[PDB]
Short mmCIF file of C-alpha atoms (C1' of nucleotides) and ligand atoms in Angstrom, two decimals:
data_model
loop_
_atom_site.label_atom_id
_atom_site.label_comp_id
_atom_site.label_asym_id
_atom_site.label_seq_id
_atom_site.Cartn_x
_atom_site.Cartn_y
_atom_site.Cartn_z
CA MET A 1 -0.12 -0.01 -0.05
CA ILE A 2 1.35 3.56 -0.89
CA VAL A 3 -0.69 6.25 1.08
CA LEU A 4 -0.57 10.01 0.16
CA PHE A 5 -1.81 12.47 2.73
CA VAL A 6 -2.46 16.01 1.83
CA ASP A 7 -2.83 18.75 4.69
CA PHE A 8 -3.61 22.28 3.57
CA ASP A 9 -1.48 25.01 5.17
CA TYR A 10 -2.64 27.32 7.87
CA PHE A 11 -5.94 26.90 5.83
CA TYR A 12 -8.53 29.28 7.40
CA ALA A 13 -5.98 31.98 7.49
CA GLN A 14 -4.74 31.16 3.91
CA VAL A 15 -8.41 31.19 2.62
CA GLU A 16 -8.38 34.77 3.96
CA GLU A 17 -5.11 35.52 2.41
CA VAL A 18 -6.47 34.33 -0.79
CA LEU A 19 -9.69 36.34 -0.69
CA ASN A 20 -7.83 39.40 0.37
CA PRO A 21 -4.18 39.42 -1.18
CA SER A 22 -3.09 42.43 0.60
CA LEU A 23 -3.02 40.12 3.88
CA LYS A 24 0.14 38.13 2.78
CA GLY A 25 3.10 38.93 4.55
CA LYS A 26 1.07 40.42 7.74
CA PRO A 27 0.25 38.11 10.82
CA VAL A 28 -3.36 36.87 10.37
CA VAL A 29 -5.53 35.49 12.98
CA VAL A 30 -8.92 33.77 12.60
CA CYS A 31 -11.04 33.79 15.65
CA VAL A 32 -14.11 32.50 17.05
CA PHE A 33 -15.53 35.73 19.08
CA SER A 34 -17.65 33.93 21.66
CA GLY A 35 -19.99 36.96 22.41
CA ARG A 36 -19.43 37.27 26.05
CA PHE A 37 -17.86 40.85 26.30
CA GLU A 38 -15.37 42.74 24.43
CA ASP A 39 -12.91 40.06 22.74
CA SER A 40 -13.93 37.09 24.51
CA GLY A 41 -13.19 33.72 22.55
CA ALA A 42 -10.17 31.83 21.44
CA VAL A 43 -7.80 31.64 18.18
CA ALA A 44 -8.96 28.98 15.47
CA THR A 45 -5.65 29.35 13.69
CA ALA A 46 -3.27 31.97 12.48
CA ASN A 47 -0.75 32.25 9.60
CA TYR A 48 3.06 31.58 9.99
CA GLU A 49 3.81 35.35 10.32
CA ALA A 50 1.74 35.17 13.67
CA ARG A 51 2.82 31.68 14.74
CA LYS A 52 6.43 33.04 14.80
CA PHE A 53 5.63 35.04 17.96
CA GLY A 54 3.34 32.35 19.85
CA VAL A 55 0.00 33.24 18.45
CA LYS A 56 -1.37 29.69 17.52
CA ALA A 57 -4.51 27.74 17.54
CA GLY A 58 -6.16 27.49 20.93
CA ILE A 59 -4.92 30.61 23.14
CA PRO A 60 -7.51 33.34 23.80
CA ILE A 61 -7.85 36.16 21.77
CA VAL A 62 -7.18 38.28 24.68
CA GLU A 63 -3.56 36.64 25.13
CA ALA A 64 -3.02 37.13 21.21
CA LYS A 65 -3.69 40.60 21.18
CA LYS A 66 -0.97 41.15 24.16
CA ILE A 67 1.47 39.29 21.84
CA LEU A 68 0.68 40.99 18.58
CA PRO A 69 -1.89 43.78 19.15
CA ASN A 70 -1.34 44.94 15.55
CA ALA A 71 -1.94 41.83 13.64
CA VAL A 72 -5.10 41.29 11.60
CA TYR A 73 -7.99 39.59 13.69
CA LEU A 74 -10.62 38.19 11.29
CA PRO A 75 -13.66 36.20 12.49
CA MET A 76 -14.07 32.78 11.32
CA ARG A 77 -16.27 32.25 8.25
CA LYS A 78 -16.65 28.33 8.53
CA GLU A 79 -19.18 28.35 5.34
CA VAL A 80 -16.32 30.16 3.23
CA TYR A 81 -13.67 27.64 4.27
CA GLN A 82 -15.82 24.67 3.87
CA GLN A 83 -16.87 25.53 0.30
CA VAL A 84 -13.26 26.11 -0.71
CA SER A 85 -12.47 22.71 1.17
CA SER A 86 -14.79 20.95 -0.95
CA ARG A 87 -13.61 22.29 -4.02
CA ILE A 88 -10.17 21.17 -3.26
CA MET A 89 -11.22 17.76 -2.19
CA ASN A 90 -12.60 17.45 -5.63
CA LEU A 91 -9.49 18.25 -7.15
CA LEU A 92 -8.17 15.27 -5.12
CA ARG A 93 -10.71 12.82 -6.27
CA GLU A 94 -9.19 13.05 -9.84
CA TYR A 95 -6.03 11.12 -8.57
CA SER A 96 -7.56 8.40 -6.94
CA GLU A 97 -11.10 6.76 -6.22
CA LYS A 98 -9.79 5.45 -2.65
CA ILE A 99 -9.91 8.65 -0.69
CA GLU A 100 -10.54 9.47 2.91
CA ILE A 101 -11.37 12.89 4.02
CA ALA A 102 -10.28 13.15 7.45
CA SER A 103 -11.17 16.65 8.39
CA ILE A 104 -11.76 20.07 6.72
CA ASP A 105 -8.28 20.25 5.54
CA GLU A 106 -7.04 16.82 5.45
CA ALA A 107 -7.42 13.85 3.06
CA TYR A 108 -5.63 10.36 2.64
CA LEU A 109 -5.30 8.85 -0.94
CA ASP A 110 -4.68 5.24 -1.49
CA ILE A 111 -2.51 5.54 -4.79
CA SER A 112 -1.34 1.88 -4.50
CA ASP A 113 -3.03 1.22 -7.94
CA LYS A 114 -1.55 4.51 -9.55
CA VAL A 115 2.23 4.41 -8.92
CA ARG A 116 4.93 1.80 -8.79
CA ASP A 117 7.34 3.35 -6.42
CA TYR A 118 7.97 6.18 -3.94
CA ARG A 119 9.65 8.18 -6.88
CA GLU A 120 6.44 8.01 -8.85
CA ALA A 121 4.30 8.79 -5.70
CA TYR A 122 6.51 11.83 -5.19
CA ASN A 123 6.09 13.14 -8.56
CA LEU A 124 2.35 12.70 -8.41
CA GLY A 125 2.67 14.72 -4.98
CA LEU A 126 4.09 17.52 -6.94
CA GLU A 127 1.34 17.41 -9.62
CA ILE A 128 -1.29 17.70 -6.92
CA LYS A 129 0.43 20.48 -5.01
CA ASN A 130 0.43 22.18 -8.42
CA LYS A 131 -3.14 21.42 -9.34
CA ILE A 132 -4.44 23.01 -6.07
CA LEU A 133 -2.12 25.83 -6.42
CA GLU A 134 -3.33 26.29 -10.15
CA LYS A 135 -6.91 26.00 -9.60
CA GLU A 136 -7.40 27.65 -6.05
CA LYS A 137 -4.03 29.31 -5.00
CA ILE A 138 -3.55 27.23 -1.90
CA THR A 139 -0.44 25.59 -0.85
CA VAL A 140 -0.59 22.15 0.86
CA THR A 141 1.90 19.81 2.53
CA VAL A 142 2.15 16.21 0.90
CA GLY A 143 3.09 13.26 3.00
CA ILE A 144 3.79 9.90 1.63
CA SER A 145 4.64 6.44 3.15
CA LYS A 146 3.27 2.83 3.43
CA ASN A 147 0.36 3.72 5.81
CA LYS A 148 -1.87 6.58 6.94
CA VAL A 149 0.10 7.10 10.43
CA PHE A 150 3.46 7.56 8.53
CA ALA A 151 1.80 9.47 5.58
CA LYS A 152 0.56 11.84 8.17
CA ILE A 153 3.88 11.87 10.26
CA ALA A 154 5.61 12.62 6.83
CA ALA A 155 3.48 15.56 6.36
CA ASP A 156 3.98 16.96 10.03
CA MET A 157 7.83 16.95 9.41
CA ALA A 158 7.56 18.84 6.14
CA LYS A 159 4.89 21.25 6.40
CA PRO A 160 4.64 24.04 5.43
CA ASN A 161 4.18 24.00 1.44
CA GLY A 162 6.48 20.88 1.51
CA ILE A 163 6.48 17.24 0.52
CA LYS A 164 8.06 14.25 2.01
CA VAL A 165 8.54 10.37 1.51
CA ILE A 166 9.19 8.14 4.26
CA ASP A 167 10.43 4.70 2.65
CA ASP A 168 10.14 1.40 4.56
CA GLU A 169 13.73 1.92 5.94
CA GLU A 170 13.03 5.36 7.63
CA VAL A 171 10.04 3.82 9.00
CA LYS A 172 11.97 1.55 10.72
CA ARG A 173 14.22 4.45 11.77
CA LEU A 174 11.48 6.46 13.21
CA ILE A 175 10.24 3.28 15.13
CA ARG A 176 13.22 3.66 17.09
CA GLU A 177 13.76 7.22 16.93
CA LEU A 178 10.58 9.06 16.79
CA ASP A 179 9.32 10.84 19.88
CA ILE A 180 6.39 8.73 20.80
CA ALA A 181 4.16 11.90 21.55
CA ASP A 182 4.45 12.89 17.84
CA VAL A 183 2.41 9.79 16.76
CA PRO A 184 -1.14 10.66 15.40
CA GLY A 185 -3.62 9.73 18.03
CA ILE A 186 -1.41 10.18 21.11
CA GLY A 187 -2.66 13.32 22.86
CA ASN A 188 -1.42 14.85 26.18
CA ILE A 189 -3.19 12.45 28.59
CA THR A 190 -1.79 9.59 26.71
CA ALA A 191 1.71 11.00 26.38
CA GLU A 192 2.07 11.79 30.03
CA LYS A 193 1.38 8.00 30.64
CA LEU A 194 3.83 6.65 28.22
CA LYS A 195 6.37 9.18 29.72
CA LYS A 196 5.60 7.63 33.22
CA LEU A 197 6.29 4.21 31.95
CA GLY A 198 9.56 4.89 30.42
CA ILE A 199 8.17 4.79 26.85
CA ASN A 200 9.35 7.43 24.58
CA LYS A 201 9.63 5.60 21.17
CA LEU A 202 7.24 3.28 19.62
CA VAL A 203 9.80 0.50 19.96
CA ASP A 204 9.68 0.71 23.58
CA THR A 205 6.25 -0.76 23.70
CA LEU A 206 7.47 -3.90 22.52
CA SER A 207 9.43 -4.48 25.50
CA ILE A 208 6.71 -4.28 28.24
CA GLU A 209 4.10 -6.48 29.78
CA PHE A 210 1.18 -5.88 27.47
CA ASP A 211 -1.33 -5.83 30.15
CA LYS A 212 0.70 -3.30 32.00
CA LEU A 213 0.35 -1.16 28.96
CA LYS A 214 -3.30 -1.86 28.29
CA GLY A 215 -3.88 -1.11 31.98
CA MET A 216 -2.43 2.26 31.96
CA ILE A 217 -3.64 3.58 28.47
CA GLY A 218 -6.43 1.11 27.22
CA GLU A 219 -6.75 -1.82 25.11
CA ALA A 220 -7.13 -0.02 21.84
CA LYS A 221 -4.43 2.56 22.34
CA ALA A 222 -1.90 -0.41 23.35
CA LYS A 223 -2.85 -2.57 20.23
CA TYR A 224 -2.55 0.42 18.07
CA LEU A 225 0.96 1.44 19.20
CA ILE A 226 2.15 -2.25 19.42
CA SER A 227 1.20 -2.55 15.87
CA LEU A 228 2.89 0.45 14.61
CA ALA A 229 5.91 -0.73 16.55
CA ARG A 230 6.13 -3.92 14.76
CA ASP A 231 5.75 -2.33 11.44
CA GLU A 232 2.18 -3.99 11.04
CA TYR A 233 -0.22 -1.06 10.96
CA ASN A 234 -2.15 -1.05 7.61
CA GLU A 235 -5.60 0.36 8.06
CA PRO A 236 -7.49 0.90 4.64
CA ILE A 237 -8.16 4.19 3.28
CA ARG A 238 -12.16 4.05 3.59
CA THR A 239 -14.67 6.73 2.98
CA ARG A 240 -15.65 8.92 6.04
CA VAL A 241 -19.17 8.53 7.14
CA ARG A 242 -20.23 11.37 9.42
CA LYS A 243 -21.72 9.51 12.53
CA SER A 244 -23.15 12.48 14.69
CA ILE A 245 -24.14 16.07 14.07
CA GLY A 246 -24.85 18.61 16.53
CA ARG A 247 -24.46 22.17 17.66
CA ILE A 248 -23.90 23.81 21.10
CA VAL A 249 -24.67 27.11 22.03
CA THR A 250 -22.96 29.42 24.51
CA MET A 251 -25.59 31.20 26.74
CA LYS A 252 -25.69 34.80 27.51
CA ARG A 253 -25.32 34.07 31.11
CA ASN A 254 -24.76 30.85 32.96
CA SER A 255 -27.94 29.34 34.41
CA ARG A 256 -29.77 26.38 35.97
CA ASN A 257 -33.20 27.69 35.00
CA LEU A 258 -34.96 25.48 32.73
CA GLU A 259 -37.04 28.18 30.92
CA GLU A 260 -34.00 30.31 30.75
CA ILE A 261 -31.98 27.65 28.84
CA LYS A 262 -34.82 26.41 26.65
CA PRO A 263 -34.40 29.21 23.95
CA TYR A 264 -30.85 28.20 23.35
CA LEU A 265 -31.51 24.32 23.51
CA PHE A 266 -34.23 24.77 20.69
CA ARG A 267 -31.77 26.98 18.62
CA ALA A 268 -29.46 24.24 18.81
CA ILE A 269 -31.85 21.78 17.84
CA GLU A 270 -32.98 23.73 14.59
CA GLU A 271 -29.62 24.28 13.55
CA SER A 272 -28.69 20.57 13.88
CA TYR A 273 -31.76 19.59 12.19
CA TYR A 274 -30.63 21.57 9.10
CA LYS A 275 -27.23 20.26 9.10
CA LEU A 276 -28.75 16.75 9.15
CA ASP A 277 -29.97 17.40 5.83
CA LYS A 278 -32.28 14.40 4.86
CA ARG A 279 -30.44 12.40 7.63
CA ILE A 280 -32.89 10.83 10.17
CA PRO A 281 -31.27 10.23 13.53
CA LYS A 282 -32.71 7.38 15.86
CA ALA A 283 -30.24 8.91 18.78
CA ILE A 284 -30.28 12.22 20.45
CA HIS A 285 -27.93 13.71 23.40
CA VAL A 286 -28.20 17.01 25.26
CA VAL A 287 -24.79 18.25 25.95
CA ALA A 288 -24.06 20.53 28.57
CA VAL A 289 -21.05 22.58 29.41
CA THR A 290 -21.08 23.52 33.02
CA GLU A 291 -19.63 26.76 34.48
CA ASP A 292 -16.51 25.01 35.41
CA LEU A 293 -16.25 23.86 31.58
CA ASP A 294 -16.66 20.25 32.54
CA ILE A 295 -19.16 18.21 30.19
CA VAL A 296 -22.25 16.46 31.22
CA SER A 297 -24.43 14.71 28.55
CA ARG A 298 -27.78 12.46 28.54
CA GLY A 299 -28.93 10.85 25.78
CA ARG A 300 -31.65 8.40 24.43
CA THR A 301 -31.90 6.10 21.34
CA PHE A 302 -35.29 5.42 19.88
CA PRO A 303 -36.21 2.50 17.72
CA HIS A 304 -37.22 4.55 15.00
CA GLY A 305 -36.21 8.03 13.45
CA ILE A 306 -36.73 11.26 15.54
CA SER A 307 -38.80 13.68 14.13
CA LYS A 308 -38.20 17.48 14.98
CA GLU A 309 -41.05 17.83 17.16
CA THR A 310 -39.71 14.52 19.13
CA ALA A 311 -36.47 15.85 19.37
CA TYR A 312 -37.92 19.01 21.02
CA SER A 313 -39.97 17.29 23.75
CA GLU A 314 -37.01 14.66 24.41
CA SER A 315 -34.41 17.22 24.73
CA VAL A 316 -36.30 18.87 27.32
CA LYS A 317 -36.39 15.64 29.28
CA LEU A 318 -32.83 14.91 28.68
CA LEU A 319 -32.16 18.62 29.89
CA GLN A 320 -33.98 18.06 33.12
CA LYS A 321 -32.00 14.77 33.78
CA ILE A 322 -29.05 16.96 33.39
CA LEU A 323 -30.28 19.70 35.72
CA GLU A 324 -31.35 16.75 38.13
CA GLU A 325 -28.28 14.61 38.59
CA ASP A 326 -25.72 17.68 38.37
CA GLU A 327 -25.99 20.78 40.40
CA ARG A 328 -23.48 23.18 38.36
CA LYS A 329 -24.57 26.13 36.55
CA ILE A 330 -24.70 25.50 32.70
CA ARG A 331 -22.48 27.76 30.50
CA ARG A 332 -23.36 26.45 26.79
CA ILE A 333 -26.32 23.93 26.14
CA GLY A 334 -26.16 21.84 22.95
CA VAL A 335 -27.74 18.85 21.20
CA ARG A 336 -26.11 15.95 19.11
CA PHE A 337 -27.80 13.39 16.66
CA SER A 338 -26.44 10.06 15.72
CA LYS A 339 -27.59 6.63 14.71
CA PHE A 340 -28.75 7.71 11.32
CA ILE A 341 -31.14 5.52 9.26
"C1'" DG B 1 -18.71 -17.01 27.57
"C1'" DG B 2 -19.63 -13.57 24.42
"C1'" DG B 3 -22.60 -11.30 20.57
"C1'" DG B 4 -25.26 -7.10 20.90
"C1'" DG B 5 -26.60 -2.68 22.04
"C1'" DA B 6 -27.40 1.10 25.04
"C1'" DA B 7 -25.19 4.77 28.00
"C1'" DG B 8 -22.05 8.15 29.88
"C1'" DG B 9 -17.36 10.07 30.55
"C1'" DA B 10 -12.50 10.24 28.35
"C1'" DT B 11 -9.72 11.58 24.75
"C1'" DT B 12 -8.38 13.75 20.57
"C1'" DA B 13 -6.96 17.95 16.34
"C1'" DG C 1 -16.56 25.14 14.80
"C1'" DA C 2 -17.24 19.51 16.98
"C1'" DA C 3 -16.98 14.22 16.80
"C1'" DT C 4 -15.35 9.55 17.88
"C1'" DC C 5 -13.43 6.79 20.97
"C1'" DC C 6 -13.45 3.45 24.88
"C1'" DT C 7 -15.25 1.49 28.95
"C1'" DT C 8 -18.89 -0.41 31.58
"C1'" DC C 9 -23.33 -2.31 32.24
"C1'" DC C 10 -26.96 -5.66 30.90
"C1'" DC C 11 -30.31 -8.77 28.15
"C1'" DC C 12 -30.09 -13.46 26.51
"C1'" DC C 13 -28.89 -17.83 24.16
N1 ATP D 1 -6.66 24.59 20.20
C1 ATP D 1 -5.87 23.60 19.23
N2 ATP D 1 -4.99 22.90 19.77
C2 ATP D 1 -4.14 21.85 19.21
N3 ATP D 1 -4.45 21.57 17.91
C3 ATP D 1 -5.35 22.56 17.31
C4 ATP D 1 -6.20 23.20 17.83
N4 ATP D 1 -6.99 23.99 16.78
C5 ATP D 1 -6.94 23.34 15.78
N5 ATP D 1 -5.95 22.32 15.89
C6 ATP D 1 -5.36 21.36 14.98
O1 ATP D 1 -4.65 22.27 13.93
C7 ATP D 1 -5.06 22.01 12.53
C8 ATP D 1 -5.39 23.40 11.69
O2 ATP D 1 -4.16 23.71 11.56
P1 ATP D 1 -3.81 24.79 10.08
O3 ATP D 1 -4.35 23.85 8.81
O4 ATP D 1 -4.61 25.84 10.16
O5 ATP D 1 -2.15 24.98 10.04
P2 ATP D 1 -1.31 23.76 10.15
O6 ATP D 1 -0.56 23.92 11.51
O7 ATP D 1 -0.24 23.54 9.05
O8 ATP D 1 -2.52 22.38 10.10
P3 ATP D 1 -1.78 21.12 11.09
O9 ATP D 1 -2.17 21.48 12.35
O10 ATP D 1 -2.21 19.85 10.39
O11 ATP D 1 -0.03 21.48 11.26
C9 ATP D 1 -6.40 21.20 12.59
O12 ATP D 1 -6.66 20.21 11.72
C10 ATP D 1 -6.33 20.54 14.18
C1 BAP D 2 -13.83 23.37 19.47
C2 BAP D 2 -12.85 22.00 19.92
C3 BAP D 2 -12.34 21.99 21.44
C4 BAP D 2 -11.60 20.65 21.53
C5 BAP D 2 -11.41 19.90 20.88
C6 BAP D 2 -10.44 18.53 21.13
C7 BAP D 2 -10.19 17.47 20.11
C8 BAP D 2 -10.75 17.82 18.82
C9 BAP D 2 -10.41 16.85 17.62
C10 BAP D 2 -10.63 17.02 16.53
C11 BAP D 2 -11.52 17.97 16.32
C12 BAP D 2 -11.78 19.03 17.00
C13 BAP D 2 -12.58 20.07 16.76
C14 BAP D 2 -12.90 21.24 17.47
C15 BAP D 2 -12.65 21.01 19.08
C16 BAP D 2 -11.61 19.87 19.35
C17 BAP D 2 -11.42 19.04 18.16
C18 BAP D 2 -12.82 22.85 22.39
O1 BAP D 2 -11.60 23.21 23.21
C19 BAP D 2 -13.49 24.06 21.93
O2 BAP D 2 -14.42 24.61 23.12
C20 BAP D 2 -14.44 23.82 20.59
O3 BAP D 2 -15.45 23.35 21.08
CA1 CA D 3 -3.44 22.08 8.16
CA1 CA D 4 0.75 14.24 20.50
#
DNA sequence: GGGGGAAGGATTA
DNA sequence: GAATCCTTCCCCC
């Protein structure tokens, strides 16, 4: 299997740079202004000019303005990015039927039946970068290797506007030398447990009692890392099927008053139902973000599809169960639908 | 024992 | 911006 992964560079920010060329060169920051006060909210992403100074995805807008008070701050325009993303994804389908769209700006192509070696794969990578640059003027980074994980790692090492191949030999080298925290799917919580077990490389997972690893990070995570360590990871590139769809809305002020929360809840339902677009869910979950930012959720699965009216009455029951079983004030209230027919 | 499915919390980019 | 993962609990052959 030969996998080719594409990751659009600082995507949201780059799309804004494309719709407004004067932004190129300056530091650009795309935000999600929450609506609580003056500049409440967080940074969704920033271009490299801004990242040079520590302004990156995740930090509060307030902090970003203390680092770069003069950068360009743009409100996120998700619909526009999604549209551009759809177009670029269509460019990608002309290079392979087997394609896995992982997120708004990441996709995996199984090009095993299109190239004979990594040299041909690397050239197809350039072709793709050129085509996207030609049609949409967006630079992306290509990663290529024997499987999805290494193709992704390959792109992480080469971004921005890069391209890299990780042949079978370098895979073996990385299995011994790559910091295990840089492996896709290993986030902080998992990385800290591996450090506290003396595991810093994938290879280290081969010399520990399985049950001890499975006990600290879970069976799936353990089998996953072990299979990568043994150079036996080969998950196929499959089509992604959206499994849940929802919306959560931040309330004007945190509350525990059902009648005060209702309007927001119902808004989340209306939005979600639109997003569903012809999809009929059998399951619904009301999701609450408490004042201390913890997440409490209550759901229900029906034996038939949920109609909007049913979603209305059921979400209220579910909201009370949350209010009943938890005493904290609610900050954000939302809904999530799943188990489509 | 384990296939099968529902539910809630954990974890991730 | 949200979505999937993972672990536990339980019906039933
Ligand atoms: N708050 C966050 N913390 C950590 N990672 C985040 C956060 N927000 C977004 N990301 C990740 O960053 C990616 C978007 O980054 P972007 O395309 O804008 O520039 P990029 O850094 O080149 O992409 P990548 O993050 O894949 O390197 C998302 O796919 C994910
Ligand atoms: C948006 C938000 C937040 C946390 C996460 C955590 C992990 C994610 C993995 C993949 C996609 C994704 C999209 C939005 C996310 C994610 C992820 C919150 O910190 C934030 O409040 C928003 O909900
Ligand atoms: Ca990206
Ligand atoms: Ca990590």
